[PDB]
Curated annotation (Swiss-Prot):
It comes from Cryphonectria parasitica. It catalyses: Hydrolysis of proteins with specificity similar to that of pepsin A, prefers hydrophobic residues at P1 and P1', but does not cleave 14-Ala-|-Leu-15 in the B chain of insulin or Z-Glu-Tyr. Clots milk. Belongs to the peptidase A1 family. One of its GO terms (molecular function) is aspartic-type endopeptidase activity. Disulfide bonds join C255-C290. It is an enzyme of class 3 (hydrolase). The chain holds residues 90 to 419 of 419 of the full protein. Residues 17-328 form the Peptidase A1 domain. This is Endothiapepsin.
Amino acid sequence: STGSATTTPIDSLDDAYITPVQIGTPAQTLNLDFDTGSSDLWVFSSETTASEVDGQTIYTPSKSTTAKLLSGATWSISYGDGSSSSGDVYTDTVSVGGLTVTGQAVESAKKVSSSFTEDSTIDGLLGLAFSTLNTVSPTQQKTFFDNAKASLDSPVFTADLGYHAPGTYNFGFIDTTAYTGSITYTAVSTKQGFWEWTSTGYAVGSGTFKSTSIDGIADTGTTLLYLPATVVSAYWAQVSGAKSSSSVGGYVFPCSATLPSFTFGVGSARIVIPGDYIDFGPISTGSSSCFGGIQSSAGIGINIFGDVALKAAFVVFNGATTPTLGFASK
């Protein structure tokens, strides 16, 4: 089997991407944030504290003939940005782009933090990291991908995120028309539960490539590119007037600037992030200070190849017995 679904930016900055997901019988379609940095499929629901729901579409398990309470199971998750959610668990039928999993754990939120409430466009998350990170207790649950894997034509999924445009998540096949040149594969460590890999270096604009190992994670659920302070300083030094602002929370730059590209290495291959991908617009409405899309990972504890990086590539998440990651230009 295979599946193919379009993923759409939630706003004009590509802050996140939503993908329609069918849950239950008859189908209830919710728009979920596919997150290769976590491993819980959770939804706003009829159980979510009413004051914490503001415009989201909810899953109502009592209206699904295939929903079953997973008795005694609870979940609770905290994300890198400080947001969180928790609740109980149902199993139900879940379909993405025509690919169906029966008995998928659907984590129903009883509580969500303010950042989730305030984002009316995201109805929940669909985790695509390794199932070892799943938070369900006392019986850990499998991700949608892990459940689908055996049935797929090939044990892979691909992320093809758009810049200010829709893109695609495919399951079970590699669309050879969706990228240019060849796909370069690189080793993955699953030790921390992430799609963790080592970039071979970087360049800023038309500058020379610096060969240096940068361990980080491929994370579709993180907006920006978070890299070591040395790398990030080298980038922003090429933008007149750019500075790190403790009050704003990162590097800002004059909105009048033209940003240089940023290149990262994948083995001997190179992925080029155009400068425009690094512009996240005014820090507040009407400001002439703009927020940068490349930020320091110092004090996160991990480097994160988030959407800024991933949307410059066609990315293969190869879930074979020994997982790997592939990157192609597009």
